[PDB]
Structures are given as structure tokens and as C-alpha cells.
């Protein structure tokens, strides 16, 4: 499979612009990752400003972002684990658990944008 | 210290171009190449004009630029590079406007002080010639610089004539004089 | 003499995936979407409050017929 890469061309406070290459603009409400040396930072696609440029919302601390870091697509929306393995554990919005009780294993992953 | 300011309304691209080429002499060539690219846009009107649309791409604008320069190798030097910037800046649509403005700056460097002799009907040539001479035999033009001159037809005026150039004008026509006669006799 | 025809034949058929099934009498391109509004270039005959249909299958309606965009 191929990845979709993009450049971060504007960090305006807490909103991040990605300039992509052609035929790789993700649809609305599709997550994006960017690998800081601290952790991974999640972004959510909100608008298409034209010119293959997509304006996104942060999901964690948008400090430290150099311009032009290469964001990686993840195709679908933000995924959370479901099922009866999530019980009794503390999950944030991106799904990465923070009770320090290991990762959450489950057969399914789900989007947080359904009809 | 460049001549004839563009100032504001997108002639600054031309301004940059002018001053960047002013220090490297080659302006007439630049001007000629602008004439040639404007003509080869005009002499290929389907998608030479109608492919100056904002909805294309970054890449397709760049390849139109490449398609445009494919017709002629070594397009001057500076005006082939400026297009790339504009292609990347996507200000291509407001482009022949830049051609006209660079033309204005260029023929200002020549000193062609374009004028006008407005009327409500076109006139003989003898009047044209005598006025052009007068305008050339004038303070206005300091000589060493030319003097175009265009008669235009204006129905909104009732006749007469008005001379125009260097944001300096004289109107001895009919409409304004009727106006003034009326105003003074309408008390 | 031949290369103007070559440049025109390239240019009309480099964007032939864009310049055909086209010419904006009843088609357009989605220039910029966001917040449930798409500004679409083209559509040179569309009436105000006329139902457009997209290619992905969701319908829309046009309100601000503007010069450069719809």
C-alpha cells in the first residue's frame, strides 16, 4: 500500500494547515498523524482551503511543531477500541489508554463519526 | 527609485519584475517577450485565455507554464522565472493585467505620455495632427519623450472636445459649458 | 508553424480529463469545501436555488451565485 504524505505549512495557534500532493487529499473528518519525539500528535481534517491544502484541528499540544514536518494519513476517522475489553480502563479521545495498564486489545476498532 | 508607481493593486509583481530587471539592463527584451507571450496567448484563445482559471492545480499551472515555454526556448530569462512564482502563487489569472501595467511602465521609460482628445464623434485628420503637434509643442511634454494621442467617441458628452494627459486636462467642450451657463442663470 | 498546433494539441489534451466532459454549461469543479459549504467554480448556467448533484451522490443547492465561484 502507499502512504499519503503532507507538509505542515501553517501552525496558527491551535490549528494546523497541511499542504498535500495531488490525488491524495483526504476527505473531511479523516485523522492524521505526526510523529513528535515526545509522542504522536493527532489531527482531524476540518476544511479544504483549495490548492490541495487542508485545514485541521489539533488533538494534543501543538507546541514544538516545526514547519514542514511530514504528516502521515490514516485513511479513516479517529478510531477507538470497543467491546468488553475497554471496561474499567481510562481512554482519552485518541484511544491511547492512560491508566498505564498496557495497551487495549480488542477485535474491533470504530470511527467516532457515524450517521 | 523606480518610475511610475504601481502601488497596491497587484502591479507590484510587475514592480518587482521591473526593478529586478532594471539593475540587469534587459528591459526591452523583457518587454518584447511580454508582448510575444501576450500575443501567443491571444493567438490561441481556447484555453490560452480560458485556462487562466483558479480551479486547476499547483501542478497544472506549472505545466501550462512549461507548455507555454515549450513553444519557444529561452523565453528571455526573467519572465520565464516570474511565471513560476505566479504559478506557485496562483495569481496567474491577474496576468495580462500585469502585461498592460509593465507596458505602461515601459513606455513611461520611453516617455510616451499617452493622451486623449475626447469627443462625441470622430474627427478629421487635420485636427488630430494639429493637436498632436501642439501637444508635442508644449510645456507638458518636455521633449526627449514621445506623445501618443487617441480620439474617443463619447455620447455622454454633447460634443466639443477635451484634451487629457498627465492627469491634467482641459475641457472647452459643449456639455460643461451648457452646465455652467445653466448654473449661473438658475439663481 | 507546426509547433503552435503541437502546443495546442498538448494543452487541450493534457487537461483533457479536466477540459472535456466540461465547459461549465452544466458542470463544475469543487474548488473549496468546508463547514457544510462547497464553493464550486464553473456552472455558467445555474439558476439560483437549483439542485446540484455531486459525483459521490449527495445533493446540494446553490445560493450565492458570485462572479468567480458558486
Curated annotation (Swiss-Prot), chain A:
It is found in: Mitochondrion; Mitochondrion inner membrane. It comes from the Eukaryota. The modification Phosphothreonine is found at residue 74. Mitochondrial membrane ATP synthase (F(1)F(0) ATP synthase or Complex V) produces ATP from ADP in the presence of a proton gradient across the membrane which is generated by electron transport complexes of the respiratory chain. F-type ATPases consist of two structural domains, F(1) - containing the extramembraneous catalytic core, and F(0) - containing the membrane proton channel, linked together by a central stalk and a peripheral stalk. During catalysis, ATP synthesis in the catalytic domain of F(1) is coupled via a rotary mechanism of the central stalk subunits to proton translocation. Belongs to the ATPase alpha/beta chains family. Present with 164000 molecules/cell in log phase SD medium. F-type ATPases have 2 components, CF(1) - the catalytic core - and CF(0) - the membrane proton channel. CF(1) has five subunits: alpha(3), beta(3), gamma(1), delta(1), epsilon(1). CF(0) has three main subunits: a, b and c. This is ATP synthase subunit beta, mitochondrial. It comes from Saccharomyces cerevisiae (strain ATCC 204508 / S288c) (Baker's yeast). The chain holds residues 39 to 153 of 511 of the full protein.
From Swiss-Prot, chain B:
One of its GO terms (cellular component) is mitochondrial inner membrane. SUPFAM superfamilies: N-terminal domain of the delta subunit of the F1F0-ATP synthase. GO terms for molecular function: proton-transporting ATP synthase activity, rotational mechanism. GO terms for biological process: proton motive force-driven ATP synthesis; proton motive force-driven mitochondrial ATP synthesis. It holds the Pfam family OSCP. It is found in: Mitochondrion; Mitochondrion inner membrane. InterPro entries: ATP_synth_OSCP/delta_N_sf, ATPase_OSCP/d_CS, ATPase_OSCP/dsu. F-type ATPases have 2 components, CF(1) - the catalytic core - and CF(0) - the membrane proton channel. CF(1) has five subunits: alpha(3), beta(3), gamma(1), delta(1), epsilon(1). CF(0) has three main subunits: a, b and c. Present with 32400 molecules/cell in log phase SD medium. Mitochondrial membrane ATP synthase (F(1)F(0) ATP synthase or Complex V) produces ATP from ADP in the presence of a proton gradient across the membrane which is generated by electron transport complexes of the respiratory chain. F-type ATPases consist of two structural domains, F(1) - containing the extramembraneous catalytic core and F(0) - containing the membrane proton channel, linked together by a central stalk and a peripheral stalk. During catalysis, ATP synthesis in the catalytic domain of F(1) is coupled via a rotary mechanism of the central stalk subunits to proton translocation. Belongs to the ATPase delta chain family. This is ATP synthase subunit 5, mitochondrial. It comes from Saccharomyces cerevisiae (strain ATCC 204508 / S288c).
From Swiss-Prot, chain C:
F-type ATPases have 2 components, CF(1) - the catalytic core - and CF(0) - the membrane proton channel. CF(1) has five subunits: alpha(3), beta(3), gamma(1), delta(1), epsilon(1). CF(0) has three main subunits: a, b and c. The modification Phosphoserine is found at residue 19. This is ATP synthase subunit alpha, mitochondrial. Belongs to the ATPase alpha/beta chains family. Present with 41500 molecules/cell in log phase SD medium. It is found in: Mitochondrion inner membrane. Mitochondrial membrane ATP synthase (F(1)F(0) ATP synthase or Complex V) produces ATP from ADP in the presence of a proton gradient across the membrane which is generated by electron transport complexes of the respiratory chain. F-type ATPases consist of two structural domains, F(1) - containing the extramembraneous catalytic core, and F(0) - containing the membrane proton channel, linked together by a central stalk and a peripheral stalk. During catalysis, ATP synthesis in the catalytic domain of F(1) is coupled via a rotary mechanism of the central stalk subunits to proton translocation. The lineage of its organism: Eukaryota, Fungi, Dikarya, Ascomycota, Saccharomycotina.
Amino acid at each position: 500500500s502507499t502512504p499519503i504524505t503532507g507538509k505542515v505549512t501553517a501552525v496558527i495557534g491551535a490549528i494546523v494547515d497541511v499542504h498535500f500532493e495531488q490525488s491524495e487529499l483526504p476527505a473531511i473528518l479523516n485523522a492524521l498523524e505526526i510523529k513528535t519525539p515526545q509522542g504522536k500528535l493527532v489531527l482531524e481534517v476540518a476544511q479544504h482551503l483549495g490548492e490541495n491544502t487542508v485545514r485541521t484541528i489539533a488533538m494534543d499540544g501543538t507546541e514544538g511543531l516545526v514547519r514542514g514536518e511530514k504528516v502521515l494519513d490514516t485513511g479513516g476517522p479517529i478510531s477507538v477500541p470497543v467491546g468488553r475489553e475497554t471496561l474499567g480502563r481510562i481512554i482519552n479521545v485518541i484511544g491511547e489508554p492512560i491508566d498505564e495498564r498496557g495497551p487495549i486489545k480488542s477485535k474491533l476498532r470504530k470511527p467516532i463519526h457515524a450517521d | 527609485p523606480p518610475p511610475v508607481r504601481l502601488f497596491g493593486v497587484e502591479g507590484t509583481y510587475a514592480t518587482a519584475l521591473y526593478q529586478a530587471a532594471a539593475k540587469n539592463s534587459s528591459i526591452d527584451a523583457a518587454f518584447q517577450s511580454l508582448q510575444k507571450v501576450e500575443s501567443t496567448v491571444k493567438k490561441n484563445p481556447k484555453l490560452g485565455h480560458l485556462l487562466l482559471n483558479p480551479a486547476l492545480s499547483l501542478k497544472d499551472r506549472n505545466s501550462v507554464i512549461d507548455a507555454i515555454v515549450e513553444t519557444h526556448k529561452n523565453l528571455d530569462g526573467y519572465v520565464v522565472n516570474l511565471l513560476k512564482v505566479l504559478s506557485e502563487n496562483n495569481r496567474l489569472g491577474c496576468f495580462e493585467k500585469i502585461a498592460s501595467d509593465f507596458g505602461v511602465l515601459n513606455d513611461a521609460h520611453n516617455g510616451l505620455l499617452k493622451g486623449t482628445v475626447t469627443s462625441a464623434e470622430p474627427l478629421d485628420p487635420k485636427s488630430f495632427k494639429r493637436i498632436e503637434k501642439a501637444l508635442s509643442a508644449s510645456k507638458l511634454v518636455g521633449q526627449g519623450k514621445s506623445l501618443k494621442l487617441e480620439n474617443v467617441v463619447k455620447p455622454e458628452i454633447k460634443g466639443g472636445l477635451i484634451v487629457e494627459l498627465g492627469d491634467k486636462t482641459v475641457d472647452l467642450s459643449i456639455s460643461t459649458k451648457i452646465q455652467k451657463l445653466n448654473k449661473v442663470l438658475e439663481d | 508553424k507546426a509547433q503552435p498546433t503541437e502546443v495546442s494539441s498538448i494543452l487541450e489534451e493534457r487537461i483533457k480529463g479536466v477540459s472535456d466532459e466540461a465547459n461549465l454549461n452544466e458542470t463544475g469543479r469543487v474548488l473549496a469545501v468546508g463547514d457544510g459549504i462547497a464553493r464550486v467554480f464553473g456552472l455558467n448556467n445555474i439558476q439560483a436555488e437549483e439542485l446540484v448533484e455531486f459525483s459521490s451522490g449527495v445533493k446540494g443547492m446553490a445560493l450565492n451565485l458570485e462572479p468567480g465561484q458558486v
